[PDB]
Amino acid sequence: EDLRLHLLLNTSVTCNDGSPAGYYLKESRGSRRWLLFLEGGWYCFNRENCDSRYDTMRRLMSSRDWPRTRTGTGILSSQPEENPYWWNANMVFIPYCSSDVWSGASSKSEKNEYAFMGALIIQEVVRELLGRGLSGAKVLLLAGSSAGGTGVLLNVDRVAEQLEKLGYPAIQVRGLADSGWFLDNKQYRHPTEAIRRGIRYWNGVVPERCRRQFQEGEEWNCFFGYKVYPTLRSPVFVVQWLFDEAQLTVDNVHVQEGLRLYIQNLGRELRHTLKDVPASFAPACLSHEIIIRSHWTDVQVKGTSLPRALHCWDRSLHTPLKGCPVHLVDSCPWPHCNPSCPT
Numbered sequence: 078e079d080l081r082l083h084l085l086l087n088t089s090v091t092c093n094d095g096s097p098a099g100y101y102l103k104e105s106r107g108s109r110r111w112l113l114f115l116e117g118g119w120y121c122f123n124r125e126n127c128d129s130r131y132d133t134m135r136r137l138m139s140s141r142d143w144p145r146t147r148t149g150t151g152i153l154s155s156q157p158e159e160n161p162y163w164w165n166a167n168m169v170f171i172p173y174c175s176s177d178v179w180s181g182a183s184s185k186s187e188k189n190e191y192a193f194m195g196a197l198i199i200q201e202v203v204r205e206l207l208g209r210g211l212s213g214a215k216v217l218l219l220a221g222s223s224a225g226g227t228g229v230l231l232n233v234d235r236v237a238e239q240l241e242k243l244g245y246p247a248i249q250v251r252g253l254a255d256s257g258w259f260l261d262n263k264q265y266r267h268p269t270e271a272i273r274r275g276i277r278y279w280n281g282v283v284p285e286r287c288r289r290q291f292q293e294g295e296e297w298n299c300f301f302g303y304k305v306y307p308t309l310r311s312p313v314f315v316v317q318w319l320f321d322e323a324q325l326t327v328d329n330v331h332v333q334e335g336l337r338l339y340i341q342n343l344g345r346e347l348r349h350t351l352k353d354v355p356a357s358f359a360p361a362c363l364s365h366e367i368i369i370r371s372h373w374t375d376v377q378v379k380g381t382s383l384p385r386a387l388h389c390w391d392r393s394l395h396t397p398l399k400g401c402p403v404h405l406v407d408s409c410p411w412p413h414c415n416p417s418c419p420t
């Protein structure tokens with residue numbers, strides 16, 4: 078239980094119910110690497126939907142019951158055996174308590190039952206960390222899984238801009254988006270409406286260049302990785318299972334020819350969206366498993382693990398590298414055609 082909770086000193090930056098947001102921190106003095114990880118957990122998009130989430134998913138909406146510590150696992154582990162990539166980094170876990178895919182900038186008020194402050198939570202965590210050693214960082218890697226992976230795409234450039242404006246131009250801000258790269262595709266049997274409604278409910282914010290492309294009312298487009306990614310300036314590494322379980326759930330896939338063709342086309346479409354993403358890791362697996370898994374080291378694409386690919390990405394950011402690839406997308410067309418897929 079090695080990351081310690083800090084509730085935000087600015088108590089106006091709040092979780093959904095007005096309780097303070099916060100972050101869990103394990104410092105590694107001497108390391109100039111900082112990993113800020115955004116937790117996932119879907120979202121809620123209206124009063125009634127959020128009320129239900131408050132009853133049975135309250136930790137995603139409130140800090141009142143948070144534990145004082147959390148153990149870092151996977152990419153947040155400090156043990157080299159568990160985390161070959163960044164075991165010596167300063168570790169930050171930012172709990173998801175805003176239910177807004179990290180996009181919100183609205184307070185609880187006379188007219189708002191809930192606060193949706195995800196974008197402000199990230200900014201305030203960054204600001205408070207600067208006084209705790211982040212001012213000396215060389216790399217700030219903003220990582221996240223699921224809704225937190227989409228949150229990386231929505232926020233990485235805003236963090237880069239925030240640090241520049243605060244006077245820290247030497248800190249290199251980068252993103253790692255895990256399991257947050259979705260397709261606005263046709264369902265197999267019959268989400269974009271929910272995001273469209275959520276955005277209005279949350280006063281949700283999207284990256285400026287993407288906003289300017291899609292214009293008013295169409296900001297939901299920027300929640301889809303393949304549309305927002307090309308607009309981003311910060312280096313972003315994309316991790317995405319080709320057959321992500323949450324993608325299949327929203328596609329209402331739970332094998333006959335029609336479903337076989339559907340699943341094969343989904344993998345082909347996902348692979349196509351990653352062709353021009355030079356730092357990516359996309360195994361041909363059906364999984365919801367994420368990079369804070371203790372066994373995240375086990376999967377390989379073309380013989381290269383994700384910790385290796387991330388290390389090669391670090392080297393690339395110091396012309397492709399001999400034996401150290403960064404673009405790793407499976408080409409085989411069916412779940413678990415990669416033998417290293419999670420069981």
Ligand SMILES: O=c1[nH]nc2ccc(Sc3ccc(Cl)c(Cl)c3)nn12
Nearest residue numbers: 117118119223224227268300301323
């Ligand atoms: O936290 C988890 N686990 N699985 C999922 C799936 C989607 C989401 S939020 C989201 C993100 C992007 C898009 Cl384009 C849309 Cl429509 C919704 N969060 N999430």
